[model samples]
Structures are given as C-alpha cells and as structure tokens.
Target chain A: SGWVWNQFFVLEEYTGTDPLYVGKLHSDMDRGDGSIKYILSGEGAGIVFTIDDTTGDIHAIQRLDREERSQYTLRAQALDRRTGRPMEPESEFIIKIQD
Target chain B: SGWVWNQFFVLEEYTGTDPLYVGKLHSDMDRGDGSIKYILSGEGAGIVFTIDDTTGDIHAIQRLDREERSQYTLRAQALDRRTGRPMEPESEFIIKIQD
Candidate 1:
C-alpha cells in the first residue's frame, strides 16, 4: 500500500570492532524474491550508514555519538529490481540511537 | 569516588506540549542532602538539554529526531553548593534518543 514505517535503534558510544547492526527497512511490497531493491539516503547516508540493496538491512559503518546529534532523518525507497523503477514513492523515516 | 554512569534516553520525534524528561543524573554521594549541584555540558548543553542543579534531573527542550544523529557525548559535574567546587571529577556520558 505504502512505505512501511519501523522504529530503528543504534547503540550510542559503540566501540565494537565489527560493523554495528542498525536496523532494516522493508516495504511490505517486497516479496523477498530479490525483485525489489532497497535504498537509503540523506543524513549520514553513505558515510555513516549503509543499506544492503538486496536485503534492506542497514548497518552503521561509523561511530554515532548521541550528544553530538540524537537522531537522523533519512528517506527510503523500494524499487523494481528489473526495471529500476520505484516500487512506491520514497518515504522519510527516522533512526534513533538508544543508550 | 567519581560520577555514576546511568543510561539516559530521549524519545525521538516527541511532539508533546510539555517538556520531555530525558533522565536524571545523580551521584551516589549526594545522599539527597541538597548539597550537591549537578551540571550538564558539551554538545547540546543549554540548547537541547538542561539539568536541574538541585536534583540532577534532565530534560529535552526540543524535538529529537532519530536518523540525523544517534548519540551525544556529555560531561557531568557534581558540585559542592557551598564551595562551588566539584564533588567528584567531571565524567563523560552518553544520552541516546530511542525511536
């Protein structure tokens, strides 16, 4: 119907040596058949966060300091894998850092 | 000893008409005597966050949107009211905005 909104959290002051799992973004439109592509943009898009196009799984590639900034504003898009067209209009959402 | 470490959280995208309570920052040494003054500094101090010097109660004055930033780094100080001296060494802490 429309973009699905899910609450996501990233741990603040993370010092892990591995990539920190942030959260996922899935449009109910996705069939899990690899026919839909997921994209994330805006506010620490690529540098701080990365989304697996095939899975919509997002990971924090860098440190997220809460005092510096508490929240992030980003947009998500699910596109048709074959035609490279949008499955639905992109939607804006938030990703919070939990202490 | 030094300052106590407690996890504090602020709700993201809060639209309430009242001030949003983040969390309290208290030292075990205070003993509720009203002699210790708590202070919050760094990052969003005085702008986004405020601490009650008497109670160490903290609150968020504005909207906290996740996805812009995940965490904030702040230093807490416990001061002696009469002497205006620090009861303990200023300590760093994290305040997160949970989605």
Candidate 2:
C-alpha cells in the first residue's frame, strides 16, 4: 500500500548568485516493492522546481523571488514499481516563496 | 522541518542471476532545502541490501532463501545536506523474506 502526500512549501530566495535547493517530498509504500515518482504540473513548477524521478526529492531549479511569484501548486503521484500505475490519486501541493 | 521514516520492507529472491531492486525510503523536508540520506544498519543489511546515497533507492545485492534467514531489521535516517545534521531521529524497520 502507498500513502498520499499533499501540502508542501518552498521558501523564496534572491537569484543574484547561486542556485539554492528548496525542498524534498516523500511517501510510504510496501517495503522494497514501491518507488515514488514525483510529477511537477502547472506553469509555476516549470520555473520553480525539479524533482528526482527515482528519489521523489524535489529541488528548486533556480533562485526564487517572492515578489515575482508568491506560490505554486504542483502535482505529485506515486506508482507501484511493477505496475506503473498510480498507487494513489495525483495530489497537489503548494510551494510558497518567502520574503 | 523533516519527518522520520521508520518501517520498511523488502522481498527476497534467489541471487543465482541478476541483482534485484528491493525498495526505497522517503521523508519530506522543507522544500528546496532537504535531501534524504538512507543508511542501512545491522549485519543483514550489509549482506542483503545496498541503498543509493543520493536517491534512497535500495537494491538486493544477492538472492535470499527464506529457510536460511527469515527476516532482517534495518535502520534508516535523514539529514540536512547543508548542516549535515540528522533532520529527525533514526528509526528501524523489518525486512522479511517471503517464500
């Protein structure tokens, strides 16, 4: 069995210099048999974050300016390693940039 | 913020051939800032499973015979990449071999 994960947040940072890592997402499934695949949806995700396909770990692609965008609603889903089907319904979360 | 991931399971298969991927461990942290590092503890883990440092993907190094070893208890922990500190308390889980 797999669990659904929704609600996630990322703090915004200035992009004058280096790229900053924003956050990570996670879910539980049948041990040794399940792998979580994270999908980023919506226009905000394109500019805001990147997720590790194998790890479900999320990273902010670049520096975030809260003034430019206050928040993002990204969708994520988990699947059975063998079946390739959603272990749970696709869930959406909010990533907010902080000033 | 980080969450603790404790219990995990893996299925055992014969190792006469290719290595088998067993499972993955996950934990959520403050977005754009967290990474999960999976550690396998105990003698069984050394012989039974190998975990991916960057992705927390677990693989079975060899095959198992349930008659030989029925179960294994493994430990895993998550840490903040920047601070190199454990985001949460270490937790243990059981990996049982099925016939």
TM-score of each: 0.47, 0.43
lDDT of 2 by residue, A8-77 (tens): 3343433333434444445655343336555567655655577766666566667677788776777766
TM-score values for chain B across all models: 0.85, 0.75
Once fitted onto the true fold, the runs of candidate 1 whose alpha carbons sit more than 4 angstroms away are: A1-5, A15-17, B1-99
Give Cα distance to truth, residue A47, candidate 2, Å: 39
lDDT of each: 0.71, 0.56
lDDT of 2 by residue, B1-99 (tens): 122123333334334335454455556653433354556677477666778766665666777787898777777766666667876566676565654
Query: Hey, what RMSD does candidate 2 come out at?
Result: 13.9
For candidate 1, lDDT tens digit of each residue in A15-90?
A: 1445665666677677779898889999989888899999877778877678878888888888889999987778
Candidate 1 per-residue lDDT, tens place, B1-99, comes to: 111123455557562445565656667688788998888998788777888989776777867766776778887888889998987788776677656
Candidate 2, which segments miss by more than 4 Å at Cα? A1-99, B1-9, B14-17, B30-34
Candidate with the greatest lDDT versus the true structure: 1
* TM-scores of chain A in all candidate models: 0.86, 0.71
Worst 10 residues of 2 chain A by lDDT: A1-10
For model 1, the local distance difference test gives 0.71
